[PDB]
Write a protein that binds this ligand. Structure first.
Ligand SMILES: Cc1cc2nc3c(=O)[nH]c(=O)nc-3n(C[C@H](O)[C@H](O)[C@H](O)COP(=O)(O)O)c2cc1C
Ligand SMILES: COCCOC(=O)/C(=N\O)C(C)=O
Length: 367
């Protein structure tokens, strides 16, 4: 089974290639990591396994979900430390995903009820609704398009958050540059309608992600930095006229950052276009084209099964395979995939609820 061949992710020696995908679960009450998070990641940690946390706020304006953690306060750092300690006790590697939602937010999630920030003044269309703290769905508002000064301040938020993650003991961080959130709002020409140096050409639309990655690489070192993108995704009106070219433009800039820094990033993480909340062959081809173009470790994500994961690694389509929903409902997903044991179903109704146990840590282990 190729999923259990060891793999060297730069400075981290992994014993297998089953990765816990980053997953927002909304148990971090008032944006403070809670003890429930400690039990949840502990259940899923394995010796030599790689975990990526739920997306984590880099600033008070970053959030667009209720009770998601931050890592921009010392209190948050203090509580994350306890969670990282118990994961490390199991011998796992864990990265903190740094997450800014941009225009995918709401007045209720913003300080003083201010407008969410974005590359653009265009709101997400009414085809998408935002989950509210009371469990209803609200309207995405019109965002405020930020200037280049404010852009440089968001980059500094990323840099400070990456340092706080290292202070909490994280092995590294992942830049959430995917799924129509803030970075993807700069990347996608369906969203970025800017007329300054951050829009109007493919090179300009890649500026924001390049400067974010550069800042965090300089702060904590390239081999502690992973980057997630989804050039072809149907989420929150994040379309591009040429998804493969956008992906390859990002990859080229990551390659160049690596050469200038003298070290490879931890990995590039790409979401399969089939992942939803046009050809099957052209979608597998886009993934392999990006993998072949990038000088380093490739993590694929989105709709993988045990068989699809084995095949991705055996065929050289990816080095690591991250699992989301199946990891929600199978705390010992790694052992189950090793033994080819039956997997348990997941309940989407408790994906984003606040209960510290139900649908969170009460999915059982193999008997
Ligand atoms: C409940 C839930 C929360 C998620 N939260 C995040 C997130 O915060 N950041 C992110 O990059 N991806 C997030 N994802 C996407 C996953 O990281 C992963 O790519 C996806 O679940 C893989 O597809 P799979 O569930 O079939 O394994 C989330 C997915 C789910 C189902
Ligand atoms: C169909 O693609 C959906 C991608 O969006 C996500 O998976 C996500 N965060 O990135 C959350 C919070 O669910």
């Amino acid at each position: 089974n190729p999923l259990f061949s060891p793999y060297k992710m730069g400075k981290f020696n992994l014993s297998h290639r089953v990765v816990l995908a980053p997953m927002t679960r909304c148990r971090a009450l008032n944006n403070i990591p809670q003890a429930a998070l400690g039990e949840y990641y502990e259940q899923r940690a394995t010796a030599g396994g790689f975990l990526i946390t739920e997306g984590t706020m880099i600033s008070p304006t970053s959030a667009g979900f209720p009770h998601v953690p931050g890592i921009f306060t010392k209190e948050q750092v203090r509580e994350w430390k306890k969670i990282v300690d118990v994961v490390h006790a199991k011998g796992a590697v864990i990265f903190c995903q740094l997450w800014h939602v941009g225009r995918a937010s709401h007045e209720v999630y913003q300080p003083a009820g201010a407008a969410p920030i974005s590359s653009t003044e265009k709101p997400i269309s009414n085809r998408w609704r935002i989950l509210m703290p009371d469990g209803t769905h609200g309207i995405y508002p019109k965002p405020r398009a930020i200037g280049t000064y404010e852009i440089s301040q968001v980059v500094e938020d990323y840099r400070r958050s990456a340092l706080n993650a290292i202070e909490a003991g994280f092995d590294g961080i992942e830049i959430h540059g995917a799924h129509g959130y803030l970075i993807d709002q700069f990347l996608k020409d369906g969203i970025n309608d800017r007329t300054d140096e951050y829009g109007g050409s493919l090179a300009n639309r890649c500026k924001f992600i390049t400067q974010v990655v550069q800042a965090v690489v300089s702060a904590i070192g390239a081999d502690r930095v992973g980057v997630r993108v989804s050039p072809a995704i149907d989420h929150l009106d994040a379309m591009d006229s040429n998804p493969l070219s956008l992906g390859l433009a990002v990859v080229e800039r990551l390659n160049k950052i690596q050469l200038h820094s003298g070290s490879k990033l931890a990995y590039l993480h790409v979401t399969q276009p089939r992942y939803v909340a046009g050809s099957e062959e052209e979608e597998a081809r886009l993934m392999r084209t990006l993998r072949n173009a990038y000088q380093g470790t490739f993590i694929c994500s989105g709709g993988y099964t045990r068989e699809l994961g084995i095949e991705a690694v055996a065929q050289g389509d990816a080095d690591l395979v991250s699992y989301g929903r199946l990891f929600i409902s199978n705390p010992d997903l790694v052992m189950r995939i090793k033994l080819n044991a039956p997997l348990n179903k997941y309940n989407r109704k408790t994906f984003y609820t606040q209960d510290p146990v139900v649908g969170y840590t009460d999915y059982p282990f193999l008997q």
